[PDB]
Every structure is written in C-alpha cells, then in structure tokens.
Ligand binder design. Sequence first.
Ligand SMILES: *[C@@H]1O[C@H](CO)[C@@H](O[C@@H]2O[C@H](CO)[C@@H](O)[C@H](O)[C@H]2NC(C)=O)[C@H](O)[C@H]1NC(C)=O
Lengths: 214, 225, 265, 201
Amino acid sequence: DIQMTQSPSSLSASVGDRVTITCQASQDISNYLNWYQQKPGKAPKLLIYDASNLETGVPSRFSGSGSGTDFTFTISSLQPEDIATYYCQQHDALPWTFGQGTKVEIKRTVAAPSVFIFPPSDEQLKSGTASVVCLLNNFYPREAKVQWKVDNALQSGNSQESVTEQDSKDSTYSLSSTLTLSKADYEKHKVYACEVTHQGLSSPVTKSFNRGEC
Amino acid sequence: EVQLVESGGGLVQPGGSLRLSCAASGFTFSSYAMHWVRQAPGKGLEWVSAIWGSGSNTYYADSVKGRFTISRDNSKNTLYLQMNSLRAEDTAVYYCARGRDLAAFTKTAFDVWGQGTLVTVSSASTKGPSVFPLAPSSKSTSGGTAALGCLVKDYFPEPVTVSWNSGALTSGVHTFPAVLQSSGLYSLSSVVTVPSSSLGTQTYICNVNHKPSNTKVDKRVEPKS
Amino acid sequence: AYTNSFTRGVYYPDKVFRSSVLHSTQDLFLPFFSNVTWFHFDNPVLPFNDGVYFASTNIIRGWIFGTTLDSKTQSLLIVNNATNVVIKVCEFQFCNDPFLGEFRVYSSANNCTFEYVSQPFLKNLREFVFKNIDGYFKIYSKHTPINLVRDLPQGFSALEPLVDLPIGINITRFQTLLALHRGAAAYYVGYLQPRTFLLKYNENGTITDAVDCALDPLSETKCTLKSFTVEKGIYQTSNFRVQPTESIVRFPNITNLCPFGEVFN
Amino acid sequence: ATRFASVYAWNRKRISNCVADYSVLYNSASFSTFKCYGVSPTKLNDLCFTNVYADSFVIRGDEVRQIAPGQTGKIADYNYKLPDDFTGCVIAWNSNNLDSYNYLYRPLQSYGFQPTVGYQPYRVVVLSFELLHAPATVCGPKKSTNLVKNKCVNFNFNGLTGTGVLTESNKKFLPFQQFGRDIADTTDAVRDPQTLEILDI
Ligand SMILES: *[C@@H]1O[C@H](CO)[C@@H](O[C@@H]2O[C@H](CO)[C@@H](O)[C@H](O)[C@H]2NC(C)=O)[C@H](O)[C@H]1NC(C)=O
C-alpha cells in the first residue's frame, strides 16, 4: 500500500497565520491526491483536489500545492470557522489509504483554568453509584495534568476524563475528569480531592473536599 | 441539488448481518461511481468498498476483503452495502460518498460525502438513561462563579439534547462529548457555569431529551447544608 | 435631434504610407455635412448596417455589437475597465436596460468563441469608426481637444486605425454603455456609405484634407481632376441619365385555352 | 498536461489567434505515432486554418488503433467518435509509466492496467482543423531571414514580394503604416518587422 507520514501531527497558529501541512507519498503519485476538512460531528468536505484545483463553492483563501511525492498545502488567512481536522488521501492506485490527520487550532494567550470538584448527589446514591467529577473549564494550551488524591494518596487507574472540542466563540477548550467509586468504599474514605497542573498556573492548584461536609 | 440520504444503520450482535441504504436524488445515479468510507470513533478515515456502476466491477479495502458486499439499484436509484461476519473492530460511522470516476479526471474526489449512518457491533441491548445531579460545595469561596451540571448515565444509543428552564435560562450552557465506560454503556455530563449568588434563590432545572427513547427529565439542584 | 458632421469621419483607408499626394479611394466613409443622430440619459439599440461612426465628449465605457443578443447568438462586447480593455464574442445575455458598474452589463460570459485583451485609449472629443469587411472587424479612433459642446468641432482630423479582429460575426445592431452611477453625457452616431473620397497626404504622411466626390458639383470637379484647385473652365465630371420608374410586360391576350376542363371536369 | 482527460470526457480545447509551430512536436521522438490525413506534415507550416480543436484523452493499446475515421467498436460506437469526413491529425504515445484503476472507459468497463504493449495505456490527442467556418487566424510558423542592404535582393515583406536594393531612409512612416508607395501605385519603401525600421526600395 501507500503510506503517508503527514507531519506535524498537530501545530498551533494564530488568526491570519499561514498554515502548511505536508503529505508524503510512496511512488510518484503525481497529482492524484485529495484534501479534506472535517469538523466534529460533521462529514468531511473537499478542500483541494488534484493538488492544485480548488473546489467550487469554497472561499478563495484556501489553496493547495505540490506534486509527485511531496505536497505543500497553503492556508492564507485563518477564519474562526476554519477550525477542523485536515486529511490527505492518496487517489492513484485503487484509492484505499487516508492520512493520520493533523489538528489545526488557533493560537491564543495562556489562560489559567478554574478547578472545581463535584461530590456525589444524594439522588445518585440511592441508585447505588457514586461519581466524583472535577471540571477543567476554559484552559489553554490543551496540555494539562490531573492528580487525584484520596486520603493524600495519589490516585491512578480509577478516574476517567473527557475533553470538549474547540469552542466556536472563543476557541478555548473545556475538560471534565470523572472519578468513580462505590458507596461502600465511599463510607470507608474521608478526603476526596483533584489537583490540576497547567501552564497558566505557576504552581498546581489543589481543590479538596471532605465527605459529609466536615 | 445532490442529496445522499443514508439509512439502514443500527445495532447488530457480532457475527450478524445488516443491510445499509444510501438513497440518491438530484443527479444521474446510474452514470456515476459510488463509494463507501467509514471512520472509527475517534480514529481516522478508512475506505470500505466501491461499485462502479456495473454489477461486476466491485472493489474492497484489504480490511474488509471477502466480508463486505456492495450493490446498487436502477429505477429508484439507491445504494446498498451487505456486511457479514462482523467483529468488534468494525464499529464505525459509515458514510456513502460520491464519485464521477466514469469522464472527469479532475473531480476524482468525492464531490459530496453523505451525512453518514452509525453502525455499532455490540451485544449490548438498548437501555434508557439514568440521570444524576452534580451538586456543588456550599462553602465554596474560591470565586464568584459556581459550576453546576447534570450527569446522564447509561444510555444507548446516541444522541441526546440538553436545554435549561424551558429556554428561560440559557446563559453559559456547555454540553460535553459522551464517553464509553467499562460497563459497556455510554455516559455523558452536561454542565453550566453560573454566578454563585443565585444558587439558593433562582431555581435551576436542567432538561435532558433523548430522541431514540423520547425521555425528558427535569431535576432541581439545591446547595447542601 | 440631428447635427451636421461637417468634415469629420475620415480615416486611413488602406494603411499604406503616401505623402505629398492626392489619392482617390472608394470605401465606407462618413459623408461630409451629413446628418448624425445626437443622443444625450437614454441609450437604445441602434442599427449597425454597413458601419457606424461614433463620437463622444469617462462616461462612455464600452460597446455591444451583435445580431440577436440575449445569449442566443454571438455578440461582440468591448469594455474599458481598469486601464485594460477587454473584448469578447461570448453568448452574453443582454439586459432590458444595460447598465455598467464588479459589473452587470458584462455578466453571463459563457460559450466564448473569441477573446482579446488590449491597452485602451480614450473637453475632449473621442471619435471611433466600426466597420465589418469580409469578416474583419476594424476599429479606428482618435482623441482630440474640443472647446465647445453645441455641435461638432470646426477642425479637421483623420482617424488612425487601432484594432483589426478576424472575428467574422454578422453584426446588424449595436448599443453603447454609459458609466451609470446611482450626469448624462452626449454622443453622436453617423452611418457609412460606399462613397468615394479624395484624401490629401502631406509631406509627413498625415491626411490633412479630403473632398467628398458626391457632396456638390465643385467637389465632383475636384475629384475628377484629382486636385484641390481647379482652373477656370468647363469640365465634364459625370453623366446624367434618368432611370426607369417601373417595368411593364406586354404579351398577346386571351388566345385559345387548353381544355383542362375536359379532363378534370 | 499534468493529467490528461478521460475518453468518457475527452477534452476539447479551442486554439485560435496564435502561431502553431508543429516542427518541434513533429521532430520530437517522444510520440509513439503521428498520423495526419489530408495534408502532409511538412506543409502545415505554410498552410493556415480558421480554428483548431484539441481533443485529449487516454485509451488503451487494445483500442489505440481505433482513433481513426470510420472505425467501429465499443469506444468508436459509444465513446470518442471521429467524424466521417476530413479531420486533422492523431498523435499518440505510450504512457505506461504514468497510467499503468483510476482510468475507466465506456455498461461501463474499467481498464485492467497491469504494469508488467497491446494492453498498455496510450495518450491520444486529435487535432481537428476548421478551414472554412470563419476568417482564418491560425497559421503555421514562418522563419525570418537576415536583411541585406545596398544589393539587388529578392525580398518578401509580409507577403509583398519583389526585387530591389534595400537602403536606409529618412521617410517618416507613421506608427500604423507598414509600407509606402510612390506616385503611380508602386512600392517606394517598406517597414521591416522584428526591428521596425523604414527601408527604401
Ligand atoms: C523581436 O524579438 C527580438 C528577439 O527577442 C528582439 O530583439 C531584441 O531586442 C532587445 C530590445 O531592443 C535587445 O536588447 C536584444 O539584444 C535584441 N535581440 C536580438 C537578437 O536582436 C526584437 O527587438 C523584437 N522586436 C519587437 C518586439 O518589435
């Protein structure tokens, strides 16, 4: 088959910046390569076909280039609706393979997150489940470290996280971390706390809670 | 206007069979080449199959060679995809795409790309959701903003919609993507950012709607102690 | 309204250099002192027939020439936009009320059969000549200072050729394009006939005078003698012959009739 | 062309108002076949045409012979069809390095391109000449020669031919005139092309 080592895997640029995404090839595929723009929950949309020809109905700020085994690809002016994941697909020999994909996001100023923890509700307890959620809201960059501490013991393997995609209004992300434990084990421990390390915080900020409002 | 309305997706146990449909309207279906492309949840695009008008010039991806069969129709102009001997790796959202491989050597690409149909290969059965509130700390003095939300647990399948106070309170509503748990059932949490001083005075009611089960739940949140 | 073209409308008939000589040539010229239609703003579609003389005094931005227009037939379009004049022979669909100013009068450029791009030239009088000869569309023009707006200038100026397009379209009607902003401007239109002119080439090779051999007996005498000065005397210049008014056919009348009634009845 | 059009959509580019030099393409050895009907390939530099249309498409060796007037077959009957009467020239070359399932042909069948002559893909361009629909505008190339002064020479200036001595002149030709004539309708001087100067004859 034909392999594409599309690099970088992710890159950061600001509004109006010029974006280049490289897409290699295997054996002189000439200009039988296509480009696709995909938004979360949306079907892929053509961006550049035959490595140079723009599709109809697409704004002129989008452009592609390259031929043979190297494809340059050039964005001129970033627009806030242009946030998406871009894929290069070889289309010569029985088109099968896609690219790994590169996530293009808007560069911004580092912002410290607001950290908070949710104790389990009483309505959730009668169902037999206890969930401890820590919320990471409006932070940048996406890099963040979450340290769960129960009874001052670092936790691992018992928590789940979830990250929201790039927002349409401010291009900032939100993150939710969920810790799950049983009601019987809930009564057997006292301290529940989540610690978040982030670039916008000089030192990590720890938020703690004691069961039963102690 | 080209329109590729997809249907026929749903829930299948591993090793079962399912027939997909991709209707076409607004263009000459019989004079174009039709394709199938799928994308695994959170993964990249992977081609599936292709039928180039003839009932003999069918081509499949290496990962689905032998197992998947593609077919089309004249008259009403629709597209089919026979899927056999499914495994856990076949769970993906399936798209039917276009193709003018016949004349055009320019629009070699997939001009439209239908909206896609979801196929889940799993033995789990349909189950309605359980909703739990996310209570805050009452003695929170970290800032003037308090975070509140509702946790929708153990629903199957997607999707869900969230509203608040029948539309009278819409400021700061933020809905998170669903996640899969080790229990085999999906989970989702929807939260809202609000001023802290309105927790004990204004009534906060979160509304959760699930179209496949027509379930609507309203829950009020009050600070503890 | 009409005006007298005086002595305007002379162009180089053959693009061959001559000097200090009086040359007699017959081609489509603007008759001297002929009536020319004056337009002021409205711009209807005008017949093209065998050629048009156009004059103006930057309101005028282009011309439309054709047979049926409305994208049913090929139509010549000349527009002077952004210092680059564009000429097309596409099947443009013309408006009910063409108006330019982006642009609208030059929309729906499809099915193009000829396209050409040139460097455009335009209190100043701009004279143009448009003729179609054996498939060659010839454009002539000249820019000159003008110190009056009542009628044509009293001066003399020959128009040099500028463009020759081998388009080959049968053109029968034309219309002008004015720079409409939402300030009317005046223009003059004359029509050519196959009349013979005597053109005077100076020592530099520029046409400085000319006489229309059908304007008056004196000019006819000037033409026959191939000179602008005629000595005292009697000259024979043409031949008067009254032309017939109608044709009459006379044959013997009712003779014997063939018995068609004896076969059909 | 970086990419040629398909036979199911062969390309038709209209060429007019230009000089078409066929000597470089004719001498070029990269073409597999170059068959001209009606006129010999070496006189196209003198002859002129009103318009030329270039039909570009990819076919296969099993049908590469089918591009000719009055031919039959799936391609000749349902795909690119040559007219019954006079056409221009057919040019073809093997493109196995580039085109040997993206390419299909005309109910629809695909070419079994296996890069391992009779089945190989060939790129075909048909030049159709229209010599009567309009005034002619596409002429072949004409080579210039050097001009020799102060000697009796046989000159040809833009179609005006003759014999005489060409010398320098001080006759101010206007920018739009090419040759001047004396009294009695005979040439006195001419303006040379390529260098724009006034030569007395
Ligand atoms: C026609 O083309 C020739 C060759 O390109 C032009 O000759 C050149 O003109 C430039 C400008 O005067 C000189 O600097 C070069 O040295 C000339 N080259 C030669 C070989 O003479 C010629 O001027 C062109 N004529 C035109 C455009 O009317």
